[PDB]
Amino acid sequence: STFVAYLPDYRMQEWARREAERLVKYREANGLPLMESNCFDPNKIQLPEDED
Amino acid sequence: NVLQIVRDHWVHILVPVGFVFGCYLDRRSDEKLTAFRNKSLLFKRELRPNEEVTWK
Amino acid sequence: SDAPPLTLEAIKDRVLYVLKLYDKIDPEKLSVNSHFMKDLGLDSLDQVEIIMAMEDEFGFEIPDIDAEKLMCPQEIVDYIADKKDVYE
Amino acid sequence: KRLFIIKPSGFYDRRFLKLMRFYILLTGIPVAIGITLVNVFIGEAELADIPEGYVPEHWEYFKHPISRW
Amino acid sequence: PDSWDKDVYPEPPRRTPAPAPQTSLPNPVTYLTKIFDLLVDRPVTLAREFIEQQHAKNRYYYYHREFRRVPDITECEEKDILCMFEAEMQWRRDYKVDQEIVNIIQERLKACQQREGESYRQNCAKELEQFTQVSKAFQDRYSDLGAHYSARKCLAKQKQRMLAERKAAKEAAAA
Amino acid sequence: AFSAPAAYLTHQQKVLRLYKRALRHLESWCVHRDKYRYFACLMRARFDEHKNEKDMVKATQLLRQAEEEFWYGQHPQPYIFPESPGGTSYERYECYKVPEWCLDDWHPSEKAMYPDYFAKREQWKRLRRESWEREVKQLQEETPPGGPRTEALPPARKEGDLPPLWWHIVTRPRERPM
Amino acid sequence: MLKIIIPTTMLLPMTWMSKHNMIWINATVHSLLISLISLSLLNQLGENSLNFSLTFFSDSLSAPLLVLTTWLLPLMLMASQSHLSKETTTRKKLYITMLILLQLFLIMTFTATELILFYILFEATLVPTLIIITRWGNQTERLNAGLYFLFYTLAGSLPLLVALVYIQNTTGSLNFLIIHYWSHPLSNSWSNIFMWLACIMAFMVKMPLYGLHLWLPKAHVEAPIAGSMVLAAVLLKLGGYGMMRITTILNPLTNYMAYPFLMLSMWGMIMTSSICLRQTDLKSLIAYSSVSHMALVIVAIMIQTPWSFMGATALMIAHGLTSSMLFCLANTNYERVHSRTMILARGLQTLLPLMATWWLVASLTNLALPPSINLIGELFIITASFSWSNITIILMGMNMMITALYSLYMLITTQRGKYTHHINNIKPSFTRENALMALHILPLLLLTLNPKMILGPLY
Ligand SMILES: CCCCCCCCCCCCCCCCCC(=O)OC[C@H](COP(=O)([O-])OCC(O)COP(=O)([O-])OC[C@@H](COC(=O)CCCCCCCCCCCCCCCCC)OC(=O)CCCCCCCCCCCCCCCCC)OC(=O)CCCCCCCCCCCCCCCCC
Ligand SMILES: CCCCCCCCCCCCCCCCC[C@@H](O)O[C@H](CO[C@H](O)CCCCCCCCCCCCCCC)COP(=O)(O)OCC[N+](C)(C)C
Ligand SMILES: CCCCCCCCCCCCCCCCC[C@@H](O)O[C@H](CO[C@H](O)CCCCCCCCCCCCCCC)COP(=O)(O)OCC[N+](C)(C)C
Ligand SMILES: CCCCCCCCCCCC(=O)SCCNC(=O)CCNC(=O)[C@H](O)C(C)(C)COP(=O)(O)O
């Protein structure tokens, strides 16, 4: 139980928290939206030519 | 006098020996999957002045 | 503490007290071995009333099969003592 | 008066309980003392930026001494 | 304290009124507070001072781990297993980071609701607006992927949404 | 609870039981003592009015009518003695009752306390072990060939006999065990 | 992960070379050490799995299952040595050999990287279980129980073999990582429908799904105590593990092929809970309890959400511990009075107070008292089902009420009332039985203290 209690953070919970803090700080100051609906840049996506 | 003690309790080394042998075999198995050591786009790194491999 | 350790003498005293508060039984002619039907000349209904009077006095009911059998104050006292684990 | 009270044997349950307590405490009092000593005399690491040209060890990415060990 | 950045977790300037006694009677709360201070807060402070003195004699640092940016799932060939693996790992890390961003926003909202008291419906409009925006963005990105989610399914969802938006825009243009 | 039952009840037994039930329920209705005495005397007069009926058919018809009237007019919440089968303390102390055979499994350290009690217990056990066969044989003799017909047991008759099947009646736990 | 496999293979000759009077001691000590070693597998990552080699890998779903298996072995050893005292030395060693082989097959099953190897091990687990049941059971029904256990399983598992070899001929691989990365949707055709059924029915019969569960009461009642422990705690979870693995390639067909199994799971959950209310055998009640809990697990796996997967993992672990504890509790009374009828021995709290406390804690965890991991899993599954459809709460709600009813019915019938007068051979609880109950129950609350270790990879 002691060993399990003191297992190192390989799930990266604290790393993710610190990364999110950095991102929120940067985006809040610049006036940028906190989050983006698209997680992939549309410039690297090529939609089909014709929809008709 | 340790003859009888050993012949009565020598079965107590089989499991620890199996554990250390399994550790050794796991290291040997890891030794055969180094085709991408220090080659991933995320962890590619310049070597230190002294070290030879990034992991074993 | 709780109620005292009920004894056979107290049980007999209370039984005789209740029986001597009965109007159909003469006090002096009543004895601890007096029979209800033979000696005292009571019918079954009087015996039922006496059993109910005993129940009221001791605070506990007596089953009808057991109640029918008792005929003298000795039987009543013995039944009460056996019920309440009275040995002294 | 004082009467005898009939009960089932309470010896074996009490013996098991005290054996379990003894062994659990036997191994868990040293662990608690060691944890307290480590926390008092070897605190947690302080977050700092990676200096230029330094490549930290993999265990150097955690803050608690026991987790790092 | 300086443990956290006060820009990520902001608070109002904390205006508190000065005490204005209007009775000749003593205030039992002040007497009890003085007793609690002298009897609890000082020994605890001394113990903390001793512990920090011991800590200062053994100082070591741990570093936040940095990750480079690798090609995304869009720049990967159909059956290229290694590039797909790296892209999937990066996407999973970004998913965790987005969850933590939503967590920070929700913490802000809860703190505002508790802090503002009886005026929370009016005094917490900005935090509610921020949570609505972040929730909408997060929902678009990850909702309905389901168990066994991956970067490919997220990309398919985004492509479908872009196709629908393009068709809607072109039909509205013809109006 | 102590007497062996009979194959059936008699007419007078049924009348007495109905009389007791009616008196108890009337007392439940008549809370106060003087009112209860008044109506109990009225009930007794009503009961002994038809005491001298030599036609058993009409006697049973009257008993049937009286039982129907009692069921219509009974108290829905009659008084029950606290330790009676419907009372508030009926089986309250049953969880404190421990059978005597449990003492055979006490650890010798537990039996080190109370030496005289366990000496008396050993005497009682020896008595039972000596009397068992005589009890069994007396039951064998006194039992009719076609098996027993009632649940009544014979007493001891010989020099130092004991009433057969006595161990679990004599060694009851208690009525207030703990 | 040979550092865990090899020590068990060494348990084998250690048992067969021990003195006639030290087999239990040696087996117990080294089993506990192997469990301690396996405890290291709980250090899992957040993105991918631990890929030890080309053959074995450890995920956040299989690590708690491996820990549960390795922890269950010593408990079975302690539970078995009482009723095997009159057995000869060779047969005792053979019993321990069966248990060790079962653990080895289970350990290899949960870490195989390929589906065919997983199939071979998950099917090899049959032989030791069947031998244990049919050789060391008590009554003559054990033979029929073994037949039911064998054929119900194989009739589901053989079409899975056909489907697996077909899939490998189609896509070129059965490796789970390749299968996950190169996943393609399933069209709506009769061939795909039957492929879905072939890939699903074996795991369904393992759970077992309501209507396909008749083998379970027979096998779990007729087995010896260690057989019942390992059948309820680990072997039922093979179906859930395999189903969560295989559902990766079944989308989007599951979206509608899950309806009959969902209806069966919910209604048969209600039915098995109701069956538990009128049961004269104490072990059959625990078996039907297992069926109800596994029906909940089936629902969670079928609706395919992160919350449902988390709840399924937590519920599987919690149920394993609770059901093993309940079986041991019933076996104690059976060893005392040599009967399984529930109303024979009553008022046992008067005679055995500490065992009554163990009964109370086991039946409290059975009804999912918060904040036990039983309730964590049940509540996660209920929330996921509510999101799936708001009307499931009614069926789920009925089940919660019924489970409490039959759990407390079992407790009150066995522990309260007045002790039967004629039974005078109820000896005090041994230290071994109390230690068995404590080793069952303490890990449950310890896991409650840190619930992310049993919440699966979707955490
Ligand atoms: C009996 C058995 C019977 C059967 C039962 C079943 C048993 C099963 C057991 C199975 C095994 C289980 C093992 C579990 C392993 C887990 C260990 C672990 O992870 O430790 C975690 C944790 C340690 O945290 P950490 O991450 O290691 O430390 C991080 C920091 O770096 C540290 O920060 P720091 O730098 O400030 O250092 C603090 C340091 C030093 O702190 C201080 O010194 C300051 C304290 C305040 C003092 C200030 C005033 C007093 C002095 C003033 C006067 C003197 C000075 C001036 C002199 C003049 C006087 C005027 O203290 C410590 O180091 C922590 C204590 C060590 C505990 C370790 C636990 C190990 C247990 C393993 C054994 C298991 C068996 C049990 C046996 C154990 C023995 C009984 O330990 C705790 O449990 C802390 C709890 C205390 C918090 C306060 C409670 C808050 C209450 C909130 C809830 C309110 C609701 C009401 C509910 C109340 C219920 C409590
Ligand atoms: C008989 C008498 C009983 C009553 C008397 C008892 C007296 C009091 C003792 C009871 C203790 C009260 C419990 C209160 C909780 C305090 C402990 C808690 O704080 O520790 C937790 C830690 O608990 C452990 O993590 C959980 C234990 C792990 C359980 C695994 C079981 C071991 C394996 C056994 C076999 C496995 C079978 C099941 C297979 C899956 C905190 O977790 P965490 O938030 O992180 O800690 C933050 C700081 N860290 C990370 C630096 C450490
Ligand atoms: C006792 C517990 C046992 C375990 C329970 C196992 C559950 C198995 C149930 C299988 C679930 C669904 C199977 C097939 C999917 C749809 C079923 C069908 O009825 O739906 C319609 C099918 O239409 C008609 O029903 C045709 C089927 C009629 C013949 C089937 C026989 C059913 C009779 C019941 C026998 C019991 C079966 C179980 C044996 C125990 C849909 O219309 P259609 O779009 O055209 O078909 C879709 C497939 N397409 C797209 C390729 C065309
Ligand atoms: C609260 C509401 C409840 C009240 C409702 C109840 C109303 C019932 C009142 C009317 C019923 C009767 O009287 S019905 C009267 C029935 N008559 C007979 O049976 C005639 C033959 N007599 C005998 O059998 C015995 O002598 C015997 C009389 C039993 C005495 O026994 P002892 O002398 O050997 O003790």
Side-chain angles (χ1 to χ4, degrees), chain D residues 39-40 43 45-48 50 60-63 65, chain E residues 50-51 54-55 58-66:
Chain D
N39 284 332
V40 174
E46 175 191 326
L47 187 86
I50 313 176
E60 297 193 68
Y61 289 98
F62 313 105
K63 110 176 296 204
Chain E
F50 172 83
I51 283 188
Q54 306 304 313
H55 283 165
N58 197 320
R59 180 145 307 289
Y60 51 123
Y61 323 83
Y62 74 100
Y63 323 92
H64 179 84
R65 185 183 279 281
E66 294 291 330

Side-chain angles (χ1 to χ4, degrees), chain G residues 180-233:
Chain G
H180 208 269
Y181 279 101
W182 288 359
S183 213
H184 51 287
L186 266 195
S187 324
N188 221 354
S189 52
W190 295 111
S191 299
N192 284 336
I193 279 171
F194 279 99
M195 203 207 96
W196 195 99
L197 282 167
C199 292
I200 282 296
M201 286 318 286
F203 309 123
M204 284 285 162
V205 83
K206 275 298 200 180
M207 308 294 297
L209 167 77
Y210 177 71
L212 287 182
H213 71 282
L214 291 189
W215 64 270
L216 180 139
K218 301 207 188 211
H220 295 205
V221 168
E222 290 311 304
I225 176 61
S228 292
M229 272 151 106
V230 78
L231 273 156

Side-chain angles (χ1 to χ4, degrees), chain G residues 217-255:
Chain G
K218 301 207 188 211
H220 295 205
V221 168
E222 290 311 304
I225 176 61
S228 292
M229 272 151 106
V230 78
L231 273 156
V234 182
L235 291 176
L236 295 174
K237 314 312 149 65
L238 286 178
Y241 170 82
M243 198 135 42
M244 300 190 242
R245 289 292 188 212
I246 200 82
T247 38
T248 182
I249 65 175
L250 299 183
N251 289 312
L253 193 46
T254 306
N255 269 345

Side-chain angles (χ1 to χ4, degrees), chain E:
Chain E
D2 269 324
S3 309
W4 65 92
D5 201 299
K6 324 206 217 53
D7 268 11
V8 189
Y9 316 98
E11 289 134 79
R14 186 157 213 116
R15 331 177 309 174
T16 165
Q22 211 173 37
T23 66
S24 45
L25 310 171
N27 189 20
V29 152
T30 312
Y31 173 78
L32 286 163
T33 279
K34 294 213 324 173
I35 277 154
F36 176 95
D37 157 82
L38 165 158
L39 224 68
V40 200
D41 198 41
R42 256 153 100 170
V44 167
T45 312
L46 295 172
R48 189 48 180 184
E49 283 168 338
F50 172 83
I51 283 188
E52 283 323 88
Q53 274 179 351
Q54 306 304 313
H55 283 165
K57 315 186 321 162
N58 197 320
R59 180 145 307 289
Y60 51 123
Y61 323 83
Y62 74 100
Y63 323 92
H64 179 84
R65 185 183 279 281
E66 294 291 330
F67 282 104
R68 315 202 282 258
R69 316 271 338 153
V70 305
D72 257 346
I73 204 58
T74 52
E75 309 149 35
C76 296
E77 315 227 307
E78 205 209 5
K79 288 296 199 198
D80 190 4
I81 190 55
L82 306 157
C83 286
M84 269 159 96
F85 166 72
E86 311 233 54
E88 177 77 15
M89 293 306 119
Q90 178 176 264
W91 181 85
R92 288 181 149 266
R93 277 185 255 106
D94 290 354
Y95 193 13
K96 283 179 190 242
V97 171
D98 278 349
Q99 294 161 1
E100 294 308 306
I101 287 175
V102 177
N103 280 341
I104 283 165
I105 298 310
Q106 280 170 147
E107 294 178 33
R108 276 186 198 179
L109 186 64
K110 297 168 199 178
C112 189
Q113 201 279 331
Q114 167 64 19
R115 190 187 316 120
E116 297 312 314
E118 270 313 294
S119 304
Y120 71 98
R121 190 46 87 197
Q122 179 188 13
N123 287 7
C124 292
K126 301 288 181 283
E127 290 88 2
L128 176 58
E129 172 268 302
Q130 302 202 38
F131 178 58
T132 302
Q133 183 229 278
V134 179
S135 172
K136 182 57 173 53
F138 189 89
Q139 192 180 41
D140 275 355
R141 281 191 173 198
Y142 312 104
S143 99
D144 308 315
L145 291 190
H148 305 301
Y149 49 71
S150 49
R152 272 172 58 208
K153 292 174 181 187
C154 212
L155 179 60
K157 200 198 183 200
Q158 185 189 323
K159 273 185 197 172
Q160 185 192 256
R161 179 160 39 95
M162 299 151 101
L163 282 161
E165 294 176 324
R166 175 173 88 178
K167 189 148 89 63
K170 79 87 171 210
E171 295 220 329

Side-chain angles (χ1 to χ4, degrees), chain D residues 3-4 6-7 9-11, chain F residues 98 106-107 110 117 174 178:
Chain D
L3 304 183
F4 186 85
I6 308 189
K7 339 179 209 68
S9 189
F11 167 87
Chain F
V98 187
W106 275 24
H107 194 247
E110 315 191 83
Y117 182 89
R174 215 167 294 143
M178 284 185 210

Side-chain angles (χ1 to χ4, degrees), chain G residues 3 8 22 38 56 71 76 92 253 264 290 324 345 386:
Chain G
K3 72 194 58 191
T8 310
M22 305 270 306
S38 66
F56 294 118
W71 179 253
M76 307 161 72
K92 284 190 269 165
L253 193 46
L264 273 176
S290 285
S324 171
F386 181 79

